[PDB]
C-alpha cells in the first residue's frame, strides 16, 4: 500500500474491500481490491480476458496473506445512475445501448468459458463516453437478480444464469422498479413464481427433481406479461421473455440475443452523469 495513495472507499466487492487509489509513481487513478493457491493461477487467466465491455484488470499482487487486484477506475455504477435518473427514467436508446453492450461483454465471457455469476446494477460500471462494463466477477446479500436454478439448488451453474440476471436489470431500467425484490431465497423464488407462474415439468423438464424443489410449493398461474413491464414495446417484451425462460436450456444465449429485432435501431448515446 506504500505504492498507492488511498483516496476513497468505493465499497465491498465479492471477496474484499475496494479503494479508489493513486499509483505513487505513475499518477494513475485505479480501483484497488484487497482480498482478505489455485486462485493465484485462475485470476491470472482473468487478466487476459480483455474486451471493451469488461473491466480491465491491470495487476494481480499476492503478498502477506492478502491478494490485491488493481483494476481500471470507472466513474459511476449503474445502481447510482438509475437512482439519479428515477424521476424521468433512463431514455430508451440508452437502455438499449447498455443492454446491447452488456450482451457483447457476456457473449465474449461465455465464449471463453467465464461466467459472471453475480450480475447486479452495482457491479455494472459506466463512463461519460456511453460505455458500460461488467465488473466484480456486514453486507446483506442481494438475491433480486438470482436465476431460479441457483435458488433451487443447482450445483453446476451455466452461462444462462447471467442472461437471467441481465433480464432482471433490463426490466428494472425500463420500469424503474426491481422486477423480483425478494429478501430471502424462498421469498425470491415465490416472487418469481407469482410473476412467471410456478414452473412445472411442461415448461421446465427436470424442475421437480432439483435439490430444493418441494412438491408442496404453491401453484401460481403466470401473470400476463404486458402487465409486468408495461412501457416496453413488443420487441423488448419478446427479448425479455426469452431471457427469463425458466429452463436454462430454453433461455436465449448472449450471442443469439444480439441478433434480436429489439436491437435493429441500436445506437450509442451519451449519458448525463453528475460526478
Ligand X SMILES: CC(C)c1cnn2c(NCc3ccccc3)cc(NC[C@H]3CCNC[C@@H]3O)nc12
109 binds ligand X (CB under 6 A): no
118 binds ligand X (CB under 6 A): no
Is 200 designated active site? no
The contact mask relative to ligand X for 138-167 (x = CB under 6 A, - = no) is: ------------------------------
Q: Active-site residue among 118, 187, 235, 247?
A: 118
Grid cell of 1 as nine digits = 500500500
177 binds ligand X (CB under 6 A): no
99 close to 121: Cβ distance less than 8 angstroms: no
The secondary structure of residue 253, as a DSSP letter, is P
What residues have CB less than 8 Å from 260, skipping those under 6 apart?
235, 238, 239, 242, 252
Residues in the interface with ligand X (CB under 6 A) total: 18
Place of cell 491491470: 58
- How many Cβ atoms from other residues are within 10 Å of residue 206's Cβ? 12
* Residues within window 76-95 making contact with ligand X, judged by CB under 6 A: 76-77
31 binds ligand X (CB under 6 A): yes
21 close to 4: Cβ distance less than 8 angstroms: yes
CA torsion sign for 81, 118, 171, 167 is positive
33 binds ligand X (CB under 6 A): yes
In the set 3, 23, 85, 122, which binds ligand X (CB under 6 A)? 122
Q: Which residues pair with 59 in a beta bridge?
A: 70
Nearest to 132, CA basis, from 159, 172, 105, 171: 105
In the set 24, 47, 66, 75, which binds ligand X (CB under 6 A)? 75
What residues have CB less than 8 Å from 161, skipping those under 6 apart?
115, 117, 147, 149, 150, 248
Backbone angles phi, psi at 235, to 5 degrees: -70, -45
71 binds ligand X (CB under 6 A): yes
55 binds ligand X (CB under 6 A): yes
Candidates 21-29, 68-76, 86-94, 141-149 — which segment interacts with ligand X by CB under 6 A?
Answer: 68-76
**Least distance between ligand X and beta carbon 133 (Å):** 8
Cα–Cα–Cα angle for 184, 186, 191, rounded to 5 degrees = 90
Grid cell of 148 as nine digits = 431460479
127 binds ligand X (CB under 6 A): no
125 binds ligand X (CB under 6 A): yes
In the set 136, 149, 162, 172, which binds ligand X (CB under 6 A)? 136
For the annotated catalytic residues, the residue numbers are 118
Site residues, ligand X (CB under 6 A): 10-11, 13, 18, 31, 33, 55, 71, 73-77, 122-123, 125, 135-136
Amino acid at each position: 500500500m506504500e505504492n498507492f495513495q488511498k483516496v476513497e472507499k468505493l465499497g465491498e466487492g465479492q471477496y474484499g474491500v475496494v479503494y479508489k487509489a493513486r499509483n505513487k509513481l505513475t499518477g494513475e487513478v485505479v480501483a484497488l481490491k484487497k482480498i482478505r493457491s489455485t486462485a493465484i493461477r485462475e485470476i491470472s487467466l482473468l487478466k487476459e480476458l480483455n474486451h471493451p465491455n469488461i473491466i480491465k484488470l491491470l495487476d494481480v499482487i499476492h503478498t502477506e496473506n492478502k491478494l490485491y487486484l488493481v483494476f481500471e477506475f470507472l466513474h459511476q455504477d449503474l445502481e447510482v445512475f438509475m437512482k439519479a435518473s428515477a424521476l424521468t427514467g433512463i431514455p430508451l436508446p440508452l437502455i438499449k445501448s447498455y443492454l446491447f453492450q452488456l450482451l457483447q461483454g457476456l457473449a465474449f465471457c461465455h465464449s471463453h468459458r467465464v461466467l459472471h455469476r453475480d450480475l447486479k446494477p452495482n457491479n455494472l460500471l459506466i463512463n461519460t463516453e456511453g460505455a458500460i462494463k461488467l465488473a466484480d466477477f456486514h453486507e446483506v446479500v442481494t438475491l433480486w437478480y438470482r436465476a431460479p436454478e441457483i435458488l433451487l439448488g443447482c450445483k453446476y451453474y451455466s452461462t444462462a444464469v447471467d442472461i437471467w440476471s441481465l433480464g432482471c436489470i433490463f426490466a428494472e431500467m425500463v420500469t424503474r422498479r426491481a422486477l423480483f425484490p425478494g429478501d430471502s431465497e424462498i421469498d425470491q423464488l415465490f416472487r418469481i413464481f407469482r410473476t412467471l407462474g410456478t414452473p412445472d415439468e411442461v415448461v421446465w423438464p427436470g424442475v421437480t427433481s432439483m435439490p430444493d424443489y418441494k412438491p408442496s410449493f404453491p401453484k401460481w398461474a403466470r401473470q400476463d406479461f404486458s402487465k409486468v413491464v408495461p412501457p416496453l414495446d413488443e420487441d423488448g417484451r419478446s427479448l425479455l421473455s426469452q431471457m427469463l425462460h425458466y429452463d436454462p436450456n430454453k433461455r436465449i444465449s448472449a450471442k443469439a440475443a444480439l441478433a434480436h429485432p429489439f436491437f435493429q435501431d441500436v445506437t450509442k448515446p451519451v449519458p448525463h452523469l453528475r460526478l
